[PDB]
Design a protein around this ligand. Structure first.
Ligand SMILES: Cc1cc2nc3c(=O)[nH]c(=O)nc-3n(C[C@H](O)[C@H](O)[C@H](O)COP(=O)(O)OP(=O)(O)OC[C@H]3O[C@@H](n4cnc5c(N)ncnc54)[C@H](O)[C@@H]3O)c2cc1C
Ligand SMILES: Nc1ncnc2c1ncn2[C@@H]1O[C@H](COP(=O)(O)O)[C@@H](O)[C@H]1OP(=O)(O)O
Ligand SMILES: CCCCCCCS[C@@H]1O[C@H](CO)[C@@H](O)[C@H](O)[C@H]1O
Length: 257
């Protein structure tokens, strides 16, 4: 188990923060995968938790998007982490949110809620996504506007980039929504896909197995409800052994805070 150093921290809300750490020279992974990271308790025993790598495979540094669960063994501590301090990292990537587990196609959808946007923060900055697919749709649903900030700034920086800010724009469509606070676009991913509102707002054709591929990341309940909506459009679940139209992964275990 490696010990890497925090090089920067940013707090978004009273329950969300992101940070970057040095990457082990040897660590290799595919954008979208996750690894175990953690801290030591008081007796010096490791407290490890799965975490999607929020940064792309080519990024020399590792990024993470994290929840804050006071009373949560890991994040009650991790939320206090400072630049210069370190985290325990098991350099062994895994996960079902890899491009290789999807049949090639034209449109790739990223469906996420809460911190579930983490593996897509990585995949949206992954070159392969824009060369194996013509369009990338990022649907991010959270309760408030503030919880969408991390994703917004990330997406904004890609579209404003002097060199590719225009190459991405037009190919990457950002569709954030809130379900509690007022915002120009609201509603759950499931409802907006079922009613067809999102196809409407983005001016695109309905979803179909022939052109559409999807990756889902949220609570287990979300994942289940989303799978039903996807299957009702013709798409099917795939895997690395038998690639299909969509793949899913739990954003966290339990009902979530
Ligand atoms: C494949 C996989 C990947 C994950 N990737 C991330 C990630 O990139 N970032 C991240 O913050 N977490 C991620 N999680 C959750 C993560 O593993 C830990 O649960 C998180 O670090 C909280 O740990 P804790 O010890 O502070 O609280 P825990 O005791 O683990 O959880 C207490 C409760 O808080 C809630 N909770 C935990 N994590 C979240 C979350 N992210 N969002 C909303 N509610 C949550 C759940 O109800 C949980 O039961 C991932 C989980 C899995 C299974
Ligand atoms: N089973 C589900 N299907 C679709 N959307 C969900 C589901 N469960 C929660 N959501 C939504 O995902 C987001 C994050 O929720 P949470 O913070 O509780 O984990 C919220 O917008 C929430 O919408 P809503 O507020 O309507 O439940
Ligand atoms: C020789 C032991 C190296 C431990 C590396 C993994 C990080 S461990 C981590 O470290 C922080 C300060 O760095 C502490 O504040 C925190 O409580 C502790 O869990």
């Amino acid at each position: 188990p490696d010990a890497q150093t925090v090089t920067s921290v940013r707090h978004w809300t009273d329950t969300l923060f992101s940070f970057r750490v040095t990457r082990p020279q040897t660590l290799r992974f595919r954008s979208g995968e996750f690894v175990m990271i953690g801290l030591l308790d008081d007796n010096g025993k490791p407290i490890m938790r799965a975490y999607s790598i929020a940064s792309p495979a080519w990024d020399e540094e590792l990024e993470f998007y994290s929840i804050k669960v006071p009373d949560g063994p890991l994040t009650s501590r991790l939320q206090h982490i400072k630049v210069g301090e370190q985290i325990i990292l098991r350099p062994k990537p895994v996960g079902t949110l890899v491009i290789d587990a999807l049949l090639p196609g034209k449109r790739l959808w990223f469906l996420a809620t809460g911190t579930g946007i983490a593996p897509f923060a990585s995949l949206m900055r992954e070159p392969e996504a824009y060369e194996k697919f013509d369009e990338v749709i990022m649907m991010h649903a959270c309760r408030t506007v503030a919880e969408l900030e991390y994703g917004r700034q990330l997406v904004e920086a890609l579209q404003e980039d002097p060199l590719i800010g225009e190459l991405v724009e037009g190919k990457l469509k950002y569709y954030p929504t809130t379900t509690r606070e007022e915002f120009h676009h609201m509603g759950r991913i499931t409802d907006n896909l079922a009613s067809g509102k999102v196809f409407e707002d983005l001016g695109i054709a309905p979803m179909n197995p022939e052109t559409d591929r999807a990756m889902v990341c949220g609570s287990l309940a979300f994942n289940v409800d989303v799978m039903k909506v996807l299957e009702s459009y013709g798409l099917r679940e795939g895997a690395n052994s038998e690639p299909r139209e969509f793949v899913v992964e739990k954003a966290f275990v339990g009902e979530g805070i």
